[PDB]
Each structure stands twice: as structure tokens, then as C-alpha cells.
């Protein structure tokens, strides 16, 4: 906690919590209830962001929903984007024939280290 410590935050506790939910999200919690109306969605980094905070754009309500409510959406973005750079996260760059690009979320390169739990990356917030 940079104010007492010179430490910056290793988002490993944060990230592992994220990973747990997304990994076990091979199914979904039926107790989600809320958005049981409307069209489906896709799993992209920014969707996970809105979910992570417990925001209300999010249409999933299962997993890390309202678990990182101490972040701001663009801060959470910055992290999933830190993760894609570190390669814990791997971004699925997809563009349709309208030159509209969107990136999905998967874990690829450092993902095995995530499973081993030895994944320790940094992130800078108020810690």
C-alpha cells in the first residue's frame, strides 16, 4: 500500500479470484436471476470488466459479478489489458467484414502458470 509501503500490487490474489470464476464458468449459476431477459452476449474483456464491478450493463450475473467493485471500469480494463500483455490472458482479435474489431477473452501463453498458481504480475492502483 503505497503510502505506508513502497509496494505496488501484485494482482495475483485479484487475478486468481478472476481466473477461478471464469475457469469454473463452464456452466453458470442459476441463482443469477436478474437479466433473464434480452439477447445473449459474448465474452470479451470489457464485458468481464462491467461484471467484475457489479455494474449493470453486464448481462451475465455469474462469477466475479460484484467482486471488484473497488475498481473503476477503465481500471479493470487496464488490468485485463495488463494480463493480455503479460500473456496470462490472450486476446482473440476478431474483426468482421465491416472492419469492426473486437477481442475476446481466453487464456493461453502464461495460462499454465496461472493454473500452477505461480502467476504473479503487477498492477498499479491504490495498493
Swiss-Prot record:
Assembly and interactions? Monomer. Homodimer (via N-terminus). Homotetramer (via N-terminus); dimer of dimers. Homohexamer (via N-terminus). Self-association negatively regulates DNA unwinding amplitude and rate. Oligomeric complexes dissociate into monomer in presence of ATP. Part of the BRCA1-associated genome surveillance complex (BASC), which contains BRCA1, MSH2, MSH6, MLH1, ATM, BLM, PMS2 and the RAD50-MRE11-NBS1 protein complex. This association could be a dynamic process changing throughout the cell cycle and within subnuclear domains. Interacts with RMI complex.
Q: Which family does it belong to?
A: Belongs to the helicase family. RecQ subfamily.
Q: What is this protein called?
A: RecQ-like DNA helicase BLM
- Which residues of the complete protein does this chain represent? 1067 to 1193 of 1417
| Chain segments carrying region 3' overhang DNA-binding | 44-46, 55-59, 94-100
Q: Where in the cell is it found?
A: Nucleus
Disease link: Bloom syndrome: An autosomal recessive disorder. It is characterized by proportionate pre- and postnatal growth deficiency, sun-sensitive telangiectatic hypo- and hyperpigmented skin, predisposition to malignancy, and chromosomal instability.
Q: What is known of its domains?
A: The N-terminal region mediates dimerization and homooligomerization. Both the helicase ATP-binding domain and the helicase C-terminal domain form intramolecular interactions with the HRDC domain in a ATP-dependent manner. The HRDC domain is required for single-stranded DNA (ssDNA) and DNA Holliday junction binding.
- Tell me where the cross-link Glycyl lysine isopeptide (Lys-Gly) (interchain with G-Cter in SUMO2) is found: 59
- Protein function: ATP-dependent DNA helicase that unwinds double-stranded (ds)DNA in a 3'-5' direction. Participates in DNA replication and repair. Involved in 5'-end resection of DNA during double-strand break (DSB) repair: unwinds DNA and recruits DNA2 which mediates the cleavage of 5'-ssDNA. Stimulates DNA 4-way junction branch migration and DNA Holliday junction dissolution. Binds single-stranded DNA (ssDNA), forked duplex DNA and Holliday junction DNA. Unwinds G-quadruplex DNA; unwinding occurs in the 3'-5' direction and requires a 3' single-stranded end of at least 7 nucleotides. (Microbial infection) Eliminates nuclear HIV-1 cDNA, thereby suppressing immune sensing and proviral hyper-integration.
Q: Which organism is it from?
A: Homo sapiens (Human)
Amino acid at each position: 500500500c503505497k503510502t505506508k509501503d513502497y509496494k505496488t500490487r501484485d494482482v495475483t490474489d485479484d487475478v486468481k479470484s478472476i481466473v477461478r470464476f471464469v475457469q469454473e464458468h463452464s456452466s453458470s449459476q442459476g441463482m443469477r436471476n436478474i437479466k433473464h431477459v434480452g439477447p445473449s452476449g459474448r465474452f470479451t474483456m470489457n464485458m468481464l470488466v462491467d461484471i467484475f464491478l457489479g455494474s449493470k450493463s453486464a448481462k451475465i450475473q455469474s462469477g466475479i459479478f460484484g467482486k471488484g467493485s473497488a475498481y473503476s471500469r477503465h481500471n479493470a480494463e487496464r488490468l485485463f489489458k495488463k494480463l493480455i500483455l503479460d500473456k496470462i490472458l490472450d486476446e482473440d482479435l476478431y474483426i468482421n467484414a465491416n472492419d469492426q474489431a473486437i477481442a475476446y477473452v481466453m487464456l493461453g501463453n502464461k495460462a499454465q502458470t496461472v493454473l500452477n498458481g505461480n502467476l504473479k504480475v503487477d498492477f498499479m492502483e491504490t495498493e
